[PDB]
Write a protein that binds this ligand. Structure first.
Ligand code: K
Ligand code: K
Ligand code: K
Ligand code: K
Lengths: 292, 292, 292, 292
């Protein structure tokens, strides 16, 4: 699955900062029950930045195990070095994941030619479907529509997670790609707008804690019932915004613990515990969404 | 040594992307002869992003060995996970380096408190001097002057490579820190203004190819001879700008190859070969510098 | 009319910089023939900045005369001083114009409270319908959705020309206003996207020289035929972009002269004649739209 | 006089928004006593935006009359139409003012060539010295250093009020212009750094309420006593920032009323009364300055 409501799932941890299997199972069961279309395992919200490659691979395998064929699983596979992006992708060849989410190199700011060569190479070393992931605010570089057009000509490059929040990109990329190239929002607060312009779903942070509504909203969207969708959206909007009151996933982990979905809200440095003010803000947002 | 002209040295590579010892030796001899104050080994310009930790450690050791006591060496040790930053620093304990250049976490966008805890933990677990490194354009986060002031109270956090190009930062930081905290520009094009405002030197890309002029410019500025320094700077300005016409270190490695300082201008993906138009911009800048 | 394709009509001038009546008549006849819904007289594209209030009023009256009841006419009435915005609006009370387009004060950067008080007062001194006009790039201030919500409660404040190009604003403003509050794009290149999200039309520069297509496109949009609309849009897109290759209305005046629609492309300082390179770019864009 | 501390003087108004001669007299006497170098009359801080040309001329004449030869007066004369700028300048010929402060056209966003022709024409039709005025944040256009260099060759274009806060501009401009061209900060918070880099003074909002300290700070900076100047600046810094907590001149007129320098703190729409929270920020800044 590469459409509807996809969760960018948190990696829940015990107090030592290591993945908590009971909490992960609970989270995966929740997504199955809720109608979530797929899981992104160890993306940005899953703390890929602070997990090493073995720890990252362990979490992917465990998620796939616990999914037990009931919900598809996409692995986060992004790296700023093309060699390392290839090597991480190779870990999951034959794993049972259905695709990889691969971020534009962060830090090193490659040209458009570099972003093309980076992704072309990654795709050539795998049979797995690739979803491009563009988020200039965290990376310092921006994958432009014309380059996405170029990369969509690659057989196993099948979609983009567009996390700029720049809605003009939906139709700019769409005119350049074939009809089966998938366009996913990576920005919760603009994701219904994104779908209304022709997007096919969202890789969502909000879905962590409001998975039924999110699944519902995206179904309505896909059916063209935007006014109906929009009522759910307005309910969720304080969460769409306030899950980023502090750096993600600091707020969404707290919100998971508060809803009894994970055992602890522990994160790895440089992520720090939610502040008192942030805790009151996310609680207000949860109340507004009717989640308690 | 943490003042004056400090080179962010390229990691010269053969056609296979492997460190070239002979090219490194030439570059180190060049810096010893040209009066460069120190060498930043495997920083951003040294392609830290695309070397793994073993290659990274290898280049630092090789640099230190070749320097043979003639020039101080500072290791790039930044990482986005605090544990990984700490662990990389441990590799360089007792190595003979004089200090570390440690970047603000990139990608994950921590809060100011998170950066505080990041750098505090790194400094705690080493005796080596630590130079903080701010470059929001690549990292998506900005270490603010206030958090710098808090960090400067840590005994072994001794300076900052301020790479924003925002010159108001010089005196915002200076008023918060003790007289002996070192302020270094990480932006070649504004580095002379940075020093005129109170900064102590530069960690420089331009210095890779204009070592002597950079060293003289920085000594003049330290002496308050800004008008004299500026004459040199006006001749180095095209190079200050066009060394970034394509992503650093693409132009500067091409420059080094053109001067005969390195055997090849090879980089690792996602860095790609210089375009023809870049060759001409860079060659023009070199000639304006009087280097060709 | 406050929906469909509204032209932000150029004020054509003879070589002395004074309105050319023959060219204006020709332009108005063209819009009638073409199916344009309304004319904005002496907005930004009509050079309100360089016309004095008497000259501005003369052009409005002449346009209304020449329209001869065949096409509705909206007067530009924006001023940065509330007194002067009121006095200009008063000139057109009982003129036969159907509404006023009124820009957020430029230069002085009022708060949201100030923008509220400015527009509330303007609306209180007239019976004419008011369209808010938001274009932060030219004004240095931004009318936020919440303030537009506040102002839509005023009886004669009936719509907004949203010229930010920020598509997220369509649904942000829409949730805050009643169903009959009109939402108009003021950005040609994103205007179909804007309509697709729920907008009701566009105040267009492109419509100056491609009025049939624009009228056609907006009809399709309003009918929900976006794929069909989008084909016209792709035809017009080089014009949407290149009519701003030089400051507006420098390119659209040249394009009008080239199509034989105005006698001359004369503008008032600080607008300068189109450059040779700009002339070749706008000609290419016109050829692409199939206009010759 | 075009060096040192120059005040962008408020236009004091009674409760009806009319110039208050008695409050203006007090302010002028205050500047004569406090060693202010000159007075900018009816600039941005003097609410040029909301006075018509007759009121504008009236305030300038009244200021000049009250100054009575004791302090030089510079008129704000900027306008967005070249004809109107020229025509406003003619009003001040033979008035006794020493020069004009003329803003880059706001709103209409001319090209660099257009700004060149704008200022060239203004300078042509007067013998009065002209100070260019760059503030992109209010105008939406940026006079670049290159266009400044071209303009500085005009005999009576003698300086620039650089109000961007971008300190790299100081030496980009200085290298292009002759030694006698005057560079003035129009950004209070970065004005000392601006002078330390080579600027000759400031056209200041802070000077309205901290005239003596501003004059001393600027004399120290001119003498190269930057450390001494900076002590004063650190005490003026909260005022440098919080005089812009609400749109200028709202905070500074409230400040002037609080010190008893003006009878009322009344402004013209779209400026609105200071909020209660602004009162407290500003009162705190005044106390930190030692003024209350
Ligand atoms: K494909
Ligand atoms: K320290
Ligand atoms: K209304
Ligand atoms: K001159």
């Amino acid at each position: 699955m590469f459409t509807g409501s996809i969760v960018a799932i948190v990696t829940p941890m015990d107090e030592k900062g290591n993945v908590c299997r009971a909490s992960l199972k609970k989270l995966i069961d929740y997504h199955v029950a809720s109608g979530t279309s797929a899981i992104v395992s160890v993306g940005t919200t899953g703390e890929s930045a602070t997990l090493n490659h073995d720890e990252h691979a362990d979490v992917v395998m465990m998620t796939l195990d616990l999914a037990d064929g009931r919900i598809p699983v996409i692995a986060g596979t992004g790296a700023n070095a093309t060699a390392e992006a290839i090597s991480l992708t190779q870990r999951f060849n034959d794993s049972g994941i259905v695709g990889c989410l691969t971020v534009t190199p962060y830090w090193n700011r490659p040209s458009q030619e570099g972003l093309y060569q980076h992704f072309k190479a990654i795709a050539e070393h795998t049979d797995l479907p690739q979803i491009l992931y563009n988020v200039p605010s965290r990376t310092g570089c921006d994958l432009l529509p014309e380059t996405v057009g170029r990369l969509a000509k690659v057989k196993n490059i099948i979609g983009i997670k567009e996390a700029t929040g720049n809605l003009t990109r939906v139709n700019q990329i769409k005119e350049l790609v074939s009809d089966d190239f998938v366009l996913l929002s990576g920005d919760d607060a603009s994701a219904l707008d994104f779908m209304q312009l022709g997007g096919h779903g969202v890789i969502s942070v909000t879905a962590n804690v409001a998975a039924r509504d999110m699944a519902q909203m995206c179904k309505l969207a896909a059916e063209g019932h935007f006014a109906e969708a929009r009522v759910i959206n307005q309910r969720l909007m304080p969460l769409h915004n306030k899950l980023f009151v502090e750096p993600n996933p600091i707020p969404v982990k707290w919100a998971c613990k508060e809803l009894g979905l994970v055992a602890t809200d522990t994160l790895r440095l440089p992520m720090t515990p939610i502040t008192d003010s942030g805790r009151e803000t996310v609680r207000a947002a949860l109340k507004h969404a009717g989640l308690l």
